[PDB]
Design a protein around this ligand. Structure first.
Ligand code: NAD
Ligand code: NAD
Ligand code: KMT
Ligand code: KMT
Lengths: 330, 330
C-alpha cells in the first residue's frame, strides 16, 4: 500500500475514503520538513500539502520514494517545482476552488477601503460619538465615490477575471496587466489591457494583486514601483505576501502616498499587528489568509486533491494527472 | 433679502454663494425646534435641514413665513409633510445624490457578513494568531459561499435597484417586495418579485431594507416578522432605524435565530455600543449613518438643495420645484 502523507495538516477526513482502498493515508502536521518523520521521507510516494510548509530542492531531495505532490490550493510558490520535476516528482494544484470566494473577499476589501465600513465600526467600538452631519463627514472622512475610479488588476487569471466581473457593476473602469496571458481575453471580457506594470500603476486609483508568486515577481511592489502609483491610491493584495515589500508599503501609508491598503496575505505568516514592518502603519486592513475560505470550497478542494492522487496511483505520472504544473519533469 | 435658514447645521458655505444674490442665508445649529431663534421662526421663507432634527405639526405651526422646506438628503420621514402641505409649505428632497454611495455601502455591509472581513480584522487586532490551516477555518467559521444564496430587498426604489444590480455578479438570486411599485420593473431588471412581505422573508438568506420610513412601516421588522425569517438569516439596514424593533432584533441575535446584522441606521441616533437595546447583542455590525457619505455626494446634495431654494424664490411654488414630495399642498 503506497503511503500518502498530508504534510502540513492533521485533518484527513475528506481524503480518507477517496484513497482508503488504494493507499495508506497519514498526516505529519509539520510546519517544516524537519518535523517530517523518517518513515515518511523514505517511503512516501505521494504528498498533499497546504501553503504553510516549503519544499526546496534540499528538502525534496530528502524524499526517497516521493513521486507526486498535490497542493491543496492554487498557489505552488512554496514548492521548487523545477527541482521537483528534475527529481522525477510531479507537482499538481487545485485551480478552481475559492475562485469566487477569493473574488468576493477581495471586492469586500476594496469596498472596505472606499466606504470605510470596517474603520467606522472600529471607531464606534472605540466609543466615538457621531451626532452632527459635520461629525459624520469627519469620522467618515475619506469615504469615496467609486464610479469613475480605475481598478487595475495585476494578473488576469481566474481570480482577476472574477473580480473584474464584479467590479463593473460598481462603476469601476477595469484595466489589467498580465504579461503571460494570450491575446484576446481583454476583448472577450470587455476590459482594457495595458502592457507594462508602470502603465497600470500610473492609471489606477486602486491596484489589486491577482498574480501567482514566481521567480520574477518577488517584491513586484517595492519602493520604486510604489512611486509609480497615483498619489493616494489604494493597494489590495489577496494573492501572495511575497509580492509586496512591506517596509516600502509601511512608509507609503505613513507618508499618505497610499491612502490605504487591504492585505489578506503577508511576507511572514501568521500575521501579527504587534510584529513586523507594518507594526505601526496607519490605514491598514489585514486578514489572516482567509480570502479563500468557505465550507463548500474547503471540502471541494480537498476532494479534488485526493482525486488527483488517486489518478497518480492508478495511472502514468504525469500523463494521467489533471492539474500538473511542472512538465519540466524527469 | 428673504431669509433662508439652515436648521441643523453650522457650515453654510456651499449654499451661500448659490443664494447670496437672492437671500440672506443663516444657520441655527439647532437640534430641536426649541433652539431655533425667534427671528428665524418669524422671518424664514425657506429652510434647509438634515435628518438630525424633526419637525412635527406643532413645530411647523411656529413658522409664520415659511414657504419651502428642502431636505438635504433623500429621507423626509423626519418632517410631517401633510401638516406642512396643509399650512401651504412645500417640502422637497434630494433623491439622487448618494444612491450609489449607499448601494456600495450596503453591499459592503452584506459582504462583511458573508465573508467576515470586519470580524477577522478585529480578531487580528485582538491578537489572534492564525498559523495552521485548521486554525484558519476556525477563525473564518461562518464565512460562506455566496453563489446560490437568496438576497431579499424590502423596497425596490433607487437604492434597492442599485443594490440589485451589484448583487447579481456575486451569484445572489435577487428577490424584492415593493407594494407601491408599478408592475414591470421586475422584468426590466430581470429579477423576481414577491407580493407579500411574508413570502420575501420566507425565501431570503439575507434580507436588506431599502424602503422609506412612512406611517405604515414603522417597526416593519418586529418580533412577529422576524419569526417569518429563515433560521440563521442576515439582516442589513441602511434605510431608517425606525424600520427595526431593536429590542426584538437583540433577542433574535442572542438566540441565533438571526446569524448576524449590519446596521447603518438606528431607532435612536447617535448610536453607541454602550447604550440602547443592542447593548450586548452578538454578531452585530454598526456604522454611524455614513452609507450616504462621500465628498462628491455631500457637495452634490448641498448644491442641489440650494438650487431648489432658488427655484422656490424665483418661480412658482410648487410647479418650479424639481423634487417636491408633498403635493397635498395648500
Ligand atoms: N488569499 C488567498 O487565500 C488566495 C486564494 C486563491 C489564490 N490566491 C493566490 O492567487 C493567485 C492567483 O490565483 P488564480 O487562481 O487567479 O491564478 P491563475 O494562475 O489563474 O492566474 C494568475 C495570473 O497571474 C498572471 N501573472 C503571473 N505573474 C505576473 C506578473 N508578474 N504580473 C502580472 N501578472 C502576472 C498569470 O499570467 C496568470 O494569468 C494564486 O497564485 C494564489 O497564490 C490566494
Ligand atoms: N444610510 C443613509 O445614509 C441613507 C442614504 C440614502 C437613503 N437612506 C434611506 O433609504 C431610503 C431609500 O432611499 P431611496 O432613494 O432608494 O428611496 P426611493 O423612494 O427611491 O425608494 C424607496 C422604495 O421603498 C418602497 N417602500 C415604501 N414602503 C415600503 C414597505 N413597507 N415595504 C416595501 N417597500 C416599501 C417605496 O415604494 C419605494 O419604491 C430613504 O427613504 C432613506 O430614508 C439612507
Ligand atoms: C492552501 S489553501 C488555499 C488558499 C490559497 O491561497 C490557494 O488556494 O492557493
Ligand atoms: C441628511 S444626510 C443623508 C442621510 C440620509 O439618510 C438621506 O439621504 O436621507
Amino acid at each position: 500500500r503506497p503511503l500518502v502523507a498530508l504534510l502540513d495538516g492533521r485533518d484527513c477526513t475528506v481524503e480518507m475514503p477517496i484513497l482508503k482502498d488504494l493507499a495508506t493515508v497519514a498526516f505529519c502536521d509539520a510546519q517544516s520538513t524537519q518535523e517530517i518523520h523518517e518513515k515518511v521521507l523514505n517511503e512516501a510516494v505521494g504528498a498533499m500539502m497546504y501553503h504553510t510548509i516549503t519544499l526546496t530542492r534540499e528538502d525534496l531531495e530528502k524524499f526517497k520514494a516521493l513521486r507526486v505532490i498535490v497542493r491543496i490550493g492554487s498557489g505552488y510558490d512554496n514548492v521548487d517545482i523545477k527541482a521537483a520535476g528534475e527529481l522525477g516528482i510531479a507537482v499538481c494544484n487545485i485551480p478552481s476552488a475559492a475562485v469566487e470566494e477569493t473574488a468576493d473577499s477581495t471586492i469586500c476589501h476594496i469596498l472596505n477601503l472606499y466606504r470605510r465600513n470596517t474603520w467606522l465600526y472600529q471607531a464606534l467600538r472605540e466609543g466615538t460619538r457621531v451626532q452632527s452631519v459635520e461629525q459624520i463627514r469627519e469620522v467618515a472622512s475619506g469615504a469615496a465615490r467609486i464610479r469613475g475610479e480605475t481598478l487595475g488588476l495585476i494578473g488576469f487569471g481566474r481570480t482577476g477575471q472574477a473580480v473584474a466581473v464584479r467590479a463593473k457593476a460598481f462603476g469601476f473602469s477595469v484595466i489589467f496587466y498580465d504579461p503571460y496571458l494570450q491575446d484576446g481575453i481583454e476583448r472577450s471580457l470587455g476590459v482594457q489591457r495595458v502592457y507594462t506594470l508602470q502603465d497600470l500603476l500610473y492609471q489606477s486609483d486602486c491596484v489589486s494583486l491577482h498574480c501567482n508568486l514566481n521567480e520574477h515577481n518577488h517584491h513586484l511592489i517595492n519602493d520604486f514601483t510604489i512611486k509609480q502609483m497615483r498619489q493616494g491610491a489604494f493597494l489590495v493584495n489577496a494573492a501572495r505576501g511575497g509580492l509586496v515589500d512591506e517596509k516600502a508599503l509601511a512608509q507609503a501609508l505613513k507618508e499618505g502616498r497610499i491612502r490605504g491598503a487591504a492585505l489578506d496575505v503577508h511576507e511572514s505568516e501568521p500575521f501579527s499587528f504587534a510584529q513586523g514592518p507594518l507594526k505601526d502603519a496607519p490605514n491598514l486592513i489585514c486578514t489572516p489568509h482567509t480570502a479563500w475560505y468557505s465550507e463548500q470550497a474547503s471540502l471541494e478542494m480537498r476532494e479534488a486533491a485526493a482525486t488527483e492522487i488517486r489518478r497518480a496511483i492508478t495511472g502514468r505520472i504525469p500523463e494521467s494527472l489533471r492539474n500538473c504544473v511542472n512538465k519540466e519533469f524527469f
